[PDB]
Design a protein around this nucleic acid. Structure first.
Ligand code: NA
Ligand code: NA
Length: 580
DNA sequence: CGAATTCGCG
DNA sequence: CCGAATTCGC
């Protein structure tokens, strides 16, 4: 089968062409401070494999790596770039990233190596990474001959696949989306990950001790209320205790057995004192195992920072996801969990954390996209959207809106930006579905523009096969035509929701790029640390706070121009917690 | 090792 | 409408 290449033992001029497919291979899943196991270059002059100890010590090669006028095509350039940052080497001039290109063409493909991306264009002369490296325990770097040929075949595939991928992006009007949004974002994310977020480990350990005391006693409480010891963390054992030893009523099931989810438990609370205690235990136990212990496990003892990996090509909506640690689900809603954010601190003395977030970006996008007159006016008035929605669907004045009316209108708003559900709304408010349905319908006569939009987008998904965001991100919806009701329903919701959630994703991505540019133009030391779907988190010298208070919201509000304002709130403080 | 369950965020 | 921790059957 054998692909021919040069197994180079030193860098030559012809390897430094100003157009090349480049592979800088990091086999470790978590690429932070990870080995680079080999390098492949394919250009007009040939195909090359270089050992990294040689390549990365060659001044000419390193200068080439960092020369922006030397264009590279790659796959997961962020992976390579971060790995090089940790070695003090800058990667530049990446003009095409095959992973991001695949992602934009079809985020449902699940492309996670060069092979998977190559298959989209009938190119199969490259092996899947799994086949070469193995899976799980037996994952391993193979001897040099196998390694080098694998990396050269990936480089060769990248070299061949650029043009067909760019052609399709162009036909999709997604060329600018790749070149001007996702790829520049990828460098910014690479900076963010490398910078990391400093963690006060002493505070976490302290909070851990406080948890363990409480846990230890709630645990003991549960045992005497059950008159038995058992694993409270096993939903099956818990199910036996609750529903068999303590003959509690079964109000919901899982397919494996009894449901012990928190929504059920709340309903069981009037029956036995053990239910509130299990609930506490769950709350405290979640914080202990995931946010205390989980977090301390991934803080790097060298930097005392956590270095997340943002997955830029994973979600079907265009959102990022965040791993090891996941910094997009740090507690905020309940106070004792919110206290976790006290452990996230600036990375230097007399710096502060700065957080800015969009207020209701999704509903604002819906207003713009549906051109709903009522919804648009509400935001031009900067109304409380939940109170307005309560006024409208209950046909009452502002003074007549009760907290509970507001809470239900809130829930409809939540559900509306996730494509109603009829039944799902019912679950959230525990009402009946007929009840839930006529809230939904009362919504649609308050907002005929949104109704019209929901109907229009569903027909469009049917006729085209996909739906589109503001900046031309795509999601294919094959199930929109399915004869199975449930399946067809999910697809319909996605058709409604994806232009909403996806356009919000577009906007905050552009904002990140606009921000990064402005900060550098202003020569500020401030830099991005994290993004949480609708929220940007920075750190900077305390001396830069007042400028940032104007700069960051301006950038975020002006990222796109919609038929309604975008509104951004901001706070800063000594810790992430205090930035509220 | 991997399906299932629960819960955290948006 | 994402990811981490845990359990459990294998
Ligand atoms: Na040569
Ligand atoms: Na890479």
């Amino acid at each position: 089968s054998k692909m021919a290449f040069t197994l180079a033992d030193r860098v030559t001029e012809e390897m430094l062409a100003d157009k090349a497919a480049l592979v800088v291979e990091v086999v470790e899943e978590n690429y932070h401070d990870a080995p680079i196991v080999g390098i492949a270059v394919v250009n007009e002059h040939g195909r090359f494999f270089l050992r990294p100890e040689t390549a990365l010590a060659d001044p000419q090669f390193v200068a080439w790596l960092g020369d922006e006028t030397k264009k590279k095509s790659m796959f997961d350039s962020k992976r390579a770039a971060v790995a090089l940052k940790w070695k003090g080497i800058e990667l530049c001039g990446v003009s095409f990233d095959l992973l991001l290109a695949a992602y934009l063409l079809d985020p449902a493909q699940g492309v996670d190596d060069v092979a998977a991306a190559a298959k989209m264009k009938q190119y199969e002369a490259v092996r899947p990474d799994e086949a070469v490296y193995g899976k799980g325990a037996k994952r391993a770097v193979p001897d040099e001959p196998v390694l080098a040929e694998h990396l050269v075949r990936k480089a060769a595939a990248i070299w061949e696949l650029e043009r067909p991928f760019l052609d399709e992006l162009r036909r999709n009007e997604q060329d600018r989306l790749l070149v001007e949004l996702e790829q520049p974002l990828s460098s910014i994310l690479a900076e963010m990950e490398f910078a990391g977020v400093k963690v006060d480990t002493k505070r976490l350990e302290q909070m851990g001790k406080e948890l363990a005391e409480q846990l230890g006693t709630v645990e003991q409480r549960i045992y005497e209320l059950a008159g038995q010891e058992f694993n409270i963390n096993s939903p099956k054992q818990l199910g036996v205790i609750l529903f068999e030893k303590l003959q509690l009523p079964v109000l919901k099931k899982t397919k494996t057995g009894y449901s012990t989810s928190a929504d059920v438990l709340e309903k069981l609370a009037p029956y036995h004192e053990i239910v509130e205690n299990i609930l506490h235990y769950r709350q405290l136990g979640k914080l202990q195992s995931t946010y205390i212990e989980g977090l301390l496990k991934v803080v790097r003892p060298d930097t005392k920072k956590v270095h997340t990996i943002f997955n830029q090509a994973l979600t079907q909506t265009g959102r990022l996801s965040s791993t090891e640690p996941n910094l997009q689900n740090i507690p905020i809603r309940l106070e004792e969990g919110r206290k976790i954010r006290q452990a996230f601190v600036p990375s230097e003395s007399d710096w502060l954390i700065f957080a800015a977030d969009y207020s209701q970006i999704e509903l604002r996008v819906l207003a713009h996209i549906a051109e709903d007159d009522n919804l648009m006016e509400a935001f031009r008035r900067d109304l409380d959207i939940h109170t307005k929605t309560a006024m409208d669907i209950f046909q009452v004045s502002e003074d007549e809106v009760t907290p509970n009316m507001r809470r239900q209108a809130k829930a409809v708003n939540f559900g509306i930006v996730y494509g109603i559900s009829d039944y799902g709304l019912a679950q959230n408010l525990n009402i009946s579905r007929k009840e839930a349905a006529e809230f939904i319908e009362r919504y649609f006569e308050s907002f005929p523009g949104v109704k019209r939009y929901m109907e229009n987008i569903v027909q469009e998904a049917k006729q085209k096969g996909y739906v589109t965001t503001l900046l031309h991100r795509r999601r294919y919806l094959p199930d929109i035509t399915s004869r199975n009701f449930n399946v067809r329903s999910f697809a319909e919701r996605m058709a409604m929701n994806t232009p909403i959630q996806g356009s919000a994703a577009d906007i905050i991505k552009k904002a990140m790029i606009d921000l990064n540019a402005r900060l550098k133009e202003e020569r500020l030391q401030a830099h991005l640390l994290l993004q949480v779907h609708d929220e940007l988190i920075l750190e900077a010298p305390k001396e830069e706070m007042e400028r940032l208070c104007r700069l960051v919201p301006e950038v975020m509000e002006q990222a796109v121009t919609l038929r309604v304002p975008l509104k951004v709130d901001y706070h800063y403080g000594s810790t992430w917690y205090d930035a509220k």
